Amino acid sequence: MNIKLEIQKMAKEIGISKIGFTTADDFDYLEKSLRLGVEEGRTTGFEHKNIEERIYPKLSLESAKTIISIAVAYPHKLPQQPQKTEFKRGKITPNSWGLDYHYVLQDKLKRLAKGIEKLTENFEYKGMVDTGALVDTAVAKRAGIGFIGKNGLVISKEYGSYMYLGELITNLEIEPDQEVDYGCGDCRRCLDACPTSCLIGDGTMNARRCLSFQTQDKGMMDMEFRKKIKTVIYGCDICQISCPYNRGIDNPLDIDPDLAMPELLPFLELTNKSFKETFGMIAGSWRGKNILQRNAIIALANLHDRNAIVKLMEIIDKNNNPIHTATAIWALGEIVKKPDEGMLDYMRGLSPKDEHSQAEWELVCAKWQI
Ligand code: B12
Ligand code: SF4
Ligand code: SF4
């Protein structure tokens, strides 16, 4: 007894910015739309595939009785700007500044569980953060962490949407928290700011057209999204920056600004090894360097950076990574606005190895009236 007050006490003790409680009752109100996302092809592929495991918490535990939702806030503005150099910089979502949230939160949930082991008997748990089967977002709503916006995210009054979420499924009998009075209203800002219009209106999405996805999808980024990621080479925050509830927050926790706003051409020099050493700790490193270097080439093209030309030419001639080659060929068509005869001969004189490079090459050629 007074576990709920005791938990809350040790929560804030170990850096958890908010905590909530809810039943292990299933979530079949979601079924309908989860299944419709998959059938309509609006799913990314990152989602847990088994829909049953997604809505029935007992499939993850059995002895499930309550679920404890945690939230850890993160800064969205940079404490200290990075220092101007020769090299232009891209941006990379604050969701991925500093240590990979997955590790941070799993550590916090471990501590919370160890601190509960002491104050009861027969305690049973199952921790999740992002990579688990539950809908992290809907759990935090039932637990009154915040409400789900039209942008799909969980929004708190206190810390905005700039929170990482987690869950500790458990066999404890505990008083559910309330939920929240505040919502969206007739706000619509996010819906109108999304540069792809992926958001459907009801907190639901064609994720396939989210730029956050596009920056993480493997392969060749479709033409439409290249221009639109501007210089943001990982994630998208547009639907949160445009949100009233984020209007005036700064939040607590360590950030290297050079990892948060990386210099692009030096970034393109990284190997698997140097990439691991320097970037391996952030969330955005979970698929390796290649998707990021592709994106960086795109950023350089979006900046029309004449200083990248020689590097792009090196990527193309070496051709050890075809996605990069094809992206670079495109990038030259963007950067070199008035090509000299020498450049027309360079371009005319490539004969792309593979189909994606061939495709991008044909387009530049056509654009340059070759
Ligand atoms: C797959 C995934 C993605 C994909 C797909 C995004 C998406 N919206 O589905 C991509 C790569 C695009 C993505 C992007 C981002 N994501 Co992500 N993503 C996930 C992941 C692993 C699973 C997503 C999932 O379960 N799909 C849910 C889809 C299928 O459901 P749906 O049909 O849209 O359902 C919506 C409705 O049911 C609605 N719903 C619930 N309550 C209510 C109430 C009412 C009345 C109504 C009508 C509807 C409604 O909410 C659901 C979505 O939130 C989750 C973690 C997790 N396991 O939950 C993180 C998660 C959702 N992502 C997270 C983050 C931070 C992001 C980004 C902000 C990262 C960035 N800065 O770029 C973006 C923003 C995109 C966005 N607008 O949601 C955080 C959200 C943070 C928060 N505080 O809410 C989560 C919770 C991870 C975490 N542990 O923090 N993500
Ligand atoms: S992250 Fe960007 S692209 Fe994705 S929904 Fe939000 S605004 Fe739209
Ligand atoms: S922008 Fe407005 S509509 Fe969108 S989530 Fe924020 S509050 Fe809701």
Residue numbers in the entry: 1 to 370
What does the literature reporting this entry say, word for word?
Queuosine (Q) is a hypermodified RNA base that replaces guanine in the wobble positions of 5′-GUN-3′ tRNA molecules. The epoxyqueuosine reductase responsible, QueG, shares distant homology with the cobalamin-dependent reductive dehalogenase (RdhA), however the role played by cobalamin in QueG catalysis has remained elusive.
We subsequently repeated protein preparation, crystallization, and crystal harvesting under anaerobic conditions, leading to significantly improved x-ray diffraction. The anaerobic QueG crystal structure contains 5 monomers in the asymmetric unit (AU). No obvious differences can be observed between the individual molecules, with an r.m.s.d. between monomers ranging from 0.1–0.2 Å. Electron density for the three redox cofactors is well defined, with the corrin plane located at the bottom of a deep surface pocket, providing direct access to the cobalt ion from the solvent. The closest Fe-Fe distance between both [4Fe-4S] sulfur clusters is 9.5 Å in QueG, compared with 9.3 Å for the S. multivorans RdhA. One side of the active site cavity is markedly more hydrophilic compared with the opposite face, and consists of the strictly conserved D100-Y101-H102 QueG motif in addition to the conserved D130. A putative salt bridge network is observed between D100-H102 and Asp-130, the latter residue pointing directly toward the cobalt fifth ligand region.
